[PDB]
Amino acid sequence: CXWXKXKXWXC
Amino acid sequence: ATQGVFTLPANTRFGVTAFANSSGTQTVNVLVNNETAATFSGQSTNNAVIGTQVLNSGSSGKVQVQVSVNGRPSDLVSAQVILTNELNFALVGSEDGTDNDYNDAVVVINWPLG
Amino acid sequence: ATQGVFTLPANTRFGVTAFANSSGTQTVNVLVNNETAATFSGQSTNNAVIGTQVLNSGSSGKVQVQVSVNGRPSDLVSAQVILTNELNFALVGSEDGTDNDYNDAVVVINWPLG
Amino acid sequence: ATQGVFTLPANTRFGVTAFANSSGTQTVNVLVNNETAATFSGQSTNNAVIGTQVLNSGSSGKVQVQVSVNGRPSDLVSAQVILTNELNFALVGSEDGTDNDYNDAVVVINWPLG
Amino acid sequence: ATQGVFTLPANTRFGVTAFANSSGTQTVNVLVNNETAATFSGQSTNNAVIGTQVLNSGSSGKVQVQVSVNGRPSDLVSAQVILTNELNFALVGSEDGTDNDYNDAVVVINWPLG
Numbered sequence A: 001c002x003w004x005k006x007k008x009w010x011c
Numbered sequence B, C, D, E: 001a002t003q004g005v006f007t008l009p010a011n012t013r014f015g016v017t018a019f020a021n022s023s024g025t026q027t028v029n030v031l032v033n034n035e036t037a038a039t040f041s042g043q044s045t046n047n048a049v050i051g052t053q054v055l056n057s058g059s060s061g062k063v064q065v066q067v068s069v070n071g072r073p074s075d076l077v078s079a080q081v082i083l084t085n086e087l088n089f090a091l092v093g094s095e096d097g098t099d100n101d102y103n104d105a106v107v108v109i110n111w112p113l114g
């Protein structure tokens, strides 16, 4: 889920 | 275009079932007459059933499926299919991220029942 | 025409789920490459999920659904639908009697998973 | 199960279009409220349109497609698909022989018009 | 989600047929492997067949439908349906205005041919 760096930094 | 909205026959029972395929926790809301009639929540990357229920389509027959992950609506794809002019499937896929597999929550509505 | 037979992409995980809507006990068999991979059974007039399972389409991708009631094969209807060129549903209805509601066993196959 | 029979909303215009993919001459009959409303006949192995017409669904909304070749009824497959809860396609394939491509006559019905 | 994009089996002839239901002139472009392969234009509120053509899906099988009115892209909806595991329809609707009938250009792709 989400709009993301590194499988999730950004959400 | 609007997706996840289906006109069912008025005042009619239908089944709704949701599956999860995502690392994010899926929340599936089913609206009848614009009010939430069922809510399913769960997390699975192996197509687990996160909810199943029978509901009535209400006075207007309008049924809406909304999918969200931590409060943010996922992007929906949907269609209705009719077999032998009698058996109805309303189908929803959803995308909660960027890989566009659209399976993150899958919702199947079917009617008639009984 | 043949119904209930689908060619999936080879060695792909898929979900299969069966619903019952009949006074008769349904038996649903799922064959992959002509071998029995799953069997579901139950009796409900309210859409009970008599089985759900994750299978693999195998080297051939051939998946067939058969439905019977106390040994008597039901007449099948089926189709496959693809949304946003990626999300697949293979759909099966069946009739075990005379009212032709074709919901007596309903089977939904979905892929991709994960 | 019955194929090629569709229930449309009453008093509604719809398009019917027939394609041919066979060395045999196809005859496509379109029935509205069980009376012949259009007939197309032609031959093509290259998907040529052998007929297209605007029809009305009448008081009953019942539409039936029949296909034959040299007087023998072809086996039919059919389904209905609805996009964004508004756009309807009723789809028919037919088989006049043994290769089971079910394209020998292909009929597409669409509504609403306008 | 992306709409109007279909993956066909490679090196396979297919039919594409466009219908118009709008006060505006519809322009329909069909791209294969990212190159324009057919173009149809026309105005009709009567489901006129503004064009039909047989194309080859080529090495890529990638088929895209573009619809525009005076150079403005329409809002497309699409899906693919398969009957008796062999007869394929890729379906496109489109909306150029405010009434959301999604029929303003309708495009149907069918295969196999012959």
Ligand SMILES: *C(=O)C[C@@H]1O[C@@H](C)[C@@H](O)[C@@H](O)[C@@H]1O
Residues within 6 Å of the ligand: A001, A002, B021, B022, B023, B024, B045, B095, B096, B097, B098, B099, B100, B101, B102, B104, C114
């Ligand atoms: C979030 O974007 C990732 C998420 O969970 C993954 C395991 C995968 O299922 C992906 O499709 C889903 O969007």
Ligand SMILES: *Cc1ccccc1C*
Residues within 6 Å of the ligand: A001, A002, A003, A004, A007, A008, A009, A010, A011, B024, B069, B070
């Ligand atoms: C989509 C999501 C949910 C919760 C925490 C982090 C992220 C990226």
Ligand SMILES: [Ca+2]
Residues within 6 Å of the ligand: B022, B095, B096, B097, B098, B099, B100, B101, B102, B103, B104
């Ligand atoms: Ca995803």
Ligand SMILES: [Ca+2]
Residues within 6 Å of the ligand: B021, B022, B101, B102, B103, B104, C113, C114
């Ligand atoms: Ca996923």
Ligand SMILES: [Ca+2]
Residues within 6 Å of the ligand: C022, C095, C096, C097, C098, C099, C100, C101, C102, C103, C104
């Ligand atoms: Ca029955």
Ligand SMILES: [Ca+2]
Residues within 6 Å of the ligand: B113, B114, C021, C022, C101, C102, C103, C104
């Ligand atoms: Ca039943």
Ligand SMILES: [Ca+2]
Residues within 6 Å of the ligand: D095, D096, D097, D098, D099, D100, D101, D102, D103, D104
């Ligand atoms: Ca044939």
Ligand SMILES: [Ca+2]
Residues within 6 Å of the ligand: D021, D022, D101, D102, D103, D104, E113, E114
């Ligand atoms: Ca043929």
Ligand SMILES: [Ca+2]
Residues within 6 Å of the ligand: E022, E095, E096, E097, E098, E099, E100, E101, E102, E103, E104
């Ligand atoms: Ca419009």
Ligand SMILES: [Ca+2]
Residues within 6 Å of the ligand: D113, D114, E021, E022, E101, E102, E103, E104
């Ligand atoms: Ca229109």
